[PDB]
Amino acid sequence: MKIAEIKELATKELQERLDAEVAAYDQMRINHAVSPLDSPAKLKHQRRMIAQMKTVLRQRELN
Amino acid sequence: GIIIKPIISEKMTAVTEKMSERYGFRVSPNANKIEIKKAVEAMYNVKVEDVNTMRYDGKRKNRYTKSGLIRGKEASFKKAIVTLKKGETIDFFSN
Amino acid sequence: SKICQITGKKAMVGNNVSHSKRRTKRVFDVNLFRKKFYWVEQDCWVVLRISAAGLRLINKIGLDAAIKRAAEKGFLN
Amino acid sequence: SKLHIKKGDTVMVISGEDKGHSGRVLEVLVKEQRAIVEGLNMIKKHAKPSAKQGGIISKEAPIHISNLNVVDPKTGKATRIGRRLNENGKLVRYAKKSGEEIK
Amino acid sequence: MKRTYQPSNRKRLNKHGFRSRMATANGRRVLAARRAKGRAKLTVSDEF
RNA sequence: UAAGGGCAGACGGUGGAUGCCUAGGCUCUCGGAGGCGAAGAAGGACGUGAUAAGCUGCGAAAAGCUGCGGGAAUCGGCACAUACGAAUUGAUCCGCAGAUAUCCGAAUGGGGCAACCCGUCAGGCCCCUGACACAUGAAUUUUCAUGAGCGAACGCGGGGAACUGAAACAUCUCAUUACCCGUAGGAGAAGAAAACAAGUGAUUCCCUCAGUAGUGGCGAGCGAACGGGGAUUAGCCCAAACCGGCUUUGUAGUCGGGGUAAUAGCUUCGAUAGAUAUAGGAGAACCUACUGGAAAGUAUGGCCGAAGAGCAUGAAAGCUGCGUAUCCGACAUAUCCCUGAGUAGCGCGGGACACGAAUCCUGUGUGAAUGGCGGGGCCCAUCCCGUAAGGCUAAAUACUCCCGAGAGACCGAUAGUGAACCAGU
RNA sequence: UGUAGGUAUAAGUAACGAUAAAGGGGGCGAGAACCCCCCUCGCCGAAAGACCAAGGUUUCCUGAUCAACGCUAAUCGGAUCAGGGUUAGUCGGGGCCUAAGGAUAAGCCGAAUGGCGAUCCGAUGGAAGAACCGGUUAAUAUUCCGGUACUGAUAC
RNA sequence: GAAAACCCGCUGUUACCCGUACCGUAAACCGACACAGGUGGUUGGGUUGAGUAUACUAAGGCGCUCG
Ligand SMILES: [K+]
Ligand SMILES: [K+]
Ligand SMILES: [K+]
Ligand SMILES: [Mg+2]
Ligand SMILES: [Mg+2]
Ligand SMILES: [Mg+2]
Ligand SMILES: [Mg+2]
Ligand SMILES: [Mg+2]
Ligand SMILES: [Mg+2]
Ligand SMILES: [Mg+2]
Ligand SMILES: [Mg+2]
Ligand SMILES: [Mg+2]
Ligand SMILES: [Mg+2]
Ligand SMILES: [Mg+2]
Ligand SMILES: [Mg+2]
Ligand SMILES: [Mg+2]
Ligand SMILES: [Mg+2]
Ligand SMILES: [Mg+2]
Ligand SMILES: [Mg+2]
Ligand SMILES: [Mg+2]
Ligand SMILES: [Mg+2]
Ligand SMILES: [Mg+2]
Ligand SMILES: [Mg+2]
Ligand SMILES: [Mg+2]
Ligand SMILES: [Mg+2]
Ligand SMILES: [Mg+2]
Ligand code: NA
Ligand code: NA
Ligand code: NA
Ligand code: NA
Ligand code: NA
Ligand code: NA
């Protein structure tokens, strides 16, 4: 997802999706350690997605 | 989040061949046994029977530049040997 | 904080001077002592670390006036 | 800083061994201020059979960008370019030799 | 023969450690001077 | 006969001199700014990349996250890397505003061998983890506000040497220096006559007065002020008499608050919003020949100039590139009757004043006056000047860790900083 | 008896660090007195064997490498590079307690910085709540496994 | 010929944290060195002996990095 698709979601759905993507990122990291993936940049994309999600959640929490 | 990577080595391969319920992970140095058990259970949907831990200090290494030598060091880590319940398993090759 | 609580007097620095004008560092000390006073206006007893000059001021203007003056000038604490 | 040439532009070499030859720009190295022009400044590299069978490989080496000038779309000649906001409020490159927008 | 340096980690930290330096006004003077000089090793606590 | 040796030339070896080069130093100029920190600093520890991290950046959201403005094709930091991706549905980057921001450290819940150990109370999970609170001290009435620590120089204050000079040395000098400690601010201190003088008119700084008057084992030395010329310019406010309000206390008083009154060489009461800065936009004008690996060189012939500063480019470029002169440009966020009492004065012992015993200060002991009182180099009389024992006050002055822009008949790698690079390593 | 760097002379000299000692046969290798295996010989044996603590900090094991380091050479190494390797309810420590001493409270003293001063800190001491047997790795084992046990909290 | 804590009397389900490699009368610690020195505690078989002396010798370890 991109930043617009993230900001389109509601707070509860965004929360559930963030907890989903965190576990997905952990599994992806373990898999990349086991066997290097064809595209390592998927990990970086997931990491930045998690950061963007937390930023939006904080913006809503203090706005 | 504390699980960094699994341990693939001859010793771990032999241990898993002899037990089949025993796996190894490299985890954060400051996680305790209960935290490791909960993280493994949440990540793999299994029942964890026992956790053994050992703390490894990182190796000191030499960084070689054009001029000469710089002393450096690798990061410290913790090894977690996890034994599951009878009949359970974890797959590292799949996915 | 060895210092008079009524006048603020503290020790001075000076010289011993011999007949051949040799000068050696010295301290002029305050004639300081602890004394108990009956405060009439508050009907109680107080203990003050004062000099003989502070006692002269107390015997000149009364204890209450001396204490209020010292508090105003900051000597009391 | 914005450069006077870009990838996909037709340029003319105005100084050096390849002076007087035109070509297409394949890549721009901004930090070193150089560019790869297709077909020009060929070098022979002795490549080991490591690969992945070696040999002598001919390939283009970069040229300094102050040696390259945009080819004028009218007369096909090297020229200095300028910039103006004629394209609907957007800055565009144009050739001072003629005036046509560089494209 | 017995030489002058007989190592003891407990004594080393008790004598020259960071907390020993911070406990005294002159030790803090030493720390300030070393920071001003720009030492990478502030005290023996930094060493290993 | 040269085992070997001597001298010269040629050619090599070693070593790294020399020449040429450098943004790394050095000294300054102008304009700003002059702090950071309990909303957790300076300085560190540990982490963080697709791949080990030495630096750099960043902090479990970890070479990064969000918004607005600018810009337009590459970007994914450096130590001579590739892969793999991002990006015209506008990445990267730049300005401004936000989000996150582990542990130690004033470190502040208690301890502790810094980066660790152990807790209590409430709240959400299930032995064990995540978010709070829980230090002290002076103010305030449990709440609230401040403080603590670090840091360049300059300011003020408390203590305070010696070597040295005197051709020895003790008075004296070095010096109210070094150093230790405390504490402010953008400056600080001083400042509005109980003054200098023999007419001037608050402080501060500069040039003179002047190495003069003085002071001094009258040795070595130390060393003013008045006046004059400038920089700058600024003067104000309390206490008391008296009149009312409240409270308290004594038996109409007497205090203490707040209000009026009015403060002195002489009196007094009473009778600004536009601009600036922090990103940016445009920005003139060159051909032919020769030499050459390569022209910017040379020779021709042209053009621009409010632009002939500079740097880069395969040699030295006004017309190749970035620029330069000039003009334009901001969504934000910043900046602009009374008159001062343990006083004036005095004795003893000392100190600071240029001054080694008038003016000023005081450890000890004393002690007035209320027209009166103080000074004019010791004391007296006259004369003159001033009005102490309450307070505040800009400018002209001092400085540079930091930021921006500049400069040098300063250095050019054994030089210049210790440090041009892996440097306080 | 100046300073830095570089290079000479003495000189192919002194010396190669305990007079416990070596010989042979095979292996590998381009290269062997020295490396690996075997036989023989010799030295220690209240140690020159086996353990705990302090201190060190990857030197441990394996694969590559022989430039530098190893007072010779080296195919070897405590050397260079990379990978691997340390597993605890019962062992040791810590968590608990106090000693010397240290930091402090109320207070005392003192130009400043501060100096003292009964609760806390502080083991080298006191408590710890609690086992052994056997097997297994290239490198760990009272920790892993098979038996056999025991201890502390917690829900009936 | 310590103190204080402490301790007396008056059937499941779990078991946290740190150390654990290797050297350690030494080539890995203190001595600039792979240095004839220094380094606390335990164990230390057989014959001989009063003996942990002495001589020889198991287990184990070494022949001391120039010939
Ligand atoms: K453990
Ligand atoms: K000599
Ligand atoms: K061991
Ligand atoms: Mg000859
Ligand atoms: Mg020569
Ligand atoms: Mg977070
Ligand atoms: Mg504390
Ligand atoms: Mg003399
Ligand atoms: Mg131009
Ligand atoms: Mg130019
Ligand atoms: Mg230098
Ligand atoms: Mg000599
Ligand atoms: Mg000889
Ligand atoms: Mg010798
Ligand atoms: Mg010899
Ligand atoms: Mg032994
Ligand atoms: Mg080994
Ligand atoms: Mg090998
Ligand atoms: Mg050798
Ligand atoms: Mg090795
Ligand atoms: Mg205790
Ligand atoms: Mg072993
Ligand atoms: Mg030895
Ligand atoms: Mg014994
Ligand atoms: Mg025996
Ligand atoms: Mg014996
Ligand atoms: Na000869
Ligand atoms: Na704390
Ligand atoms: Na421009
Ligand atoms: Na040249
Ligand atoms: Na040991
Ligand atoms: Na150790």
Cβ-based neighbours of B6, under 8 Å, separated by 6 or more: A30, A33, A34, B23, B24, B25, B26, B92
Q: Residue A27 and residue B95: Cβ atoms within 8 Å? A: yes
Q: Which nucleotide is nearest to B12 (CA to C1')?
A: G84
CA dihedral defined by D39, D41, D44, D45, rounded to 10 degrees?
A: -100
- Which residues are in reach of strand H, CB within 7 A? B 29-30, 32-34, 37, 49, 53-55, 78; E 1-7
Task: Supply B33's token pair.
Answer: 């046994």
A59 and chain B in contact, CB less than 8 A: no
Q: CA nearest B76: which of E48, D72, E41?
A: E48
Task: Supply D89's token pair.
Answer: 């409020």
What type of residue sits at position D72? D
Q: Which residues of D15-40 are buried (b: 16+ CB within 10 A; e: fewer)?
A: eeebeeebbebeebeeeeebbbbeeb
Q: Which residue of B has its CA nearest to A24?
A: B43
**Distance, in angstroms, between A60 CA and closest chain B CA?**
25
CA dihedral defined by D64, D66, D70, D75, rounded to 10 degrees?
A: -120
The alpha carbon dihedral of A41, A47, A50, A54 has a sign of negative
Residues β-bridged to residue D81: D95
CA dihedral defined by C38, C40, C45, C47, rounded to 10 degrees?
A: -60
d(CA B27, CA B49): 18
d(CA D68, CA E30): 62
- Per-residue three-class SS string for chain D: CCCCCCCCCEEEECCCCCCCCEEEEEEEECCCCEEEECCCCEEEEEECCCCCCCEEEEEECCEEHHHEEEECCCCCCEECEEEEEEECCEEEEEECCCCCECC
Around Cβ B35, how many Cβ atoms within 10 Å? 16
Cβ-based neighbours of B57, under 8 Å, separated by 6 or more: B76
Q: Which residue of A has its CA nearest to B93?
A: A34
**A47 neighbors A26 (Cβ within 8 angstroms):** no
* F128: residue with closest CA to C1': B34
Residues in chain B: 95
β-pairing verdict for D90-95 and D81-87: antiparallel
d(CA E44, CA A22): 42
Q: CA nearest A30: which of B19, B48, B2, B52?
A: B2
C71 by DSSP, 3-state: which? helix
**A63 neighbors A28 (Cβ within 8 angstroms):** no
Resolution (A): 2.7
* Ramachandran angles phi, psi of C61, nearest 5°: -115, 5
Q: Which residue of A has its CA nearest to B92?
A: A34
d(CA B36, CA B23): 13
B76 by DSSP, 3-state: which? coil
Cα D92–chain centre separation:
18
**Distance, in angstroms, between B69 CA and closest chain A CA?**
30
Task: Supply E19's token pair.
Answer: 């907390």
* Ramachandran angles phi, psi of D76, nearest 5°: 60, 45
* CB pairs A-B closer than 8 Å: 25
β-pairing verdict for C32-39 and B69-73: unpaired
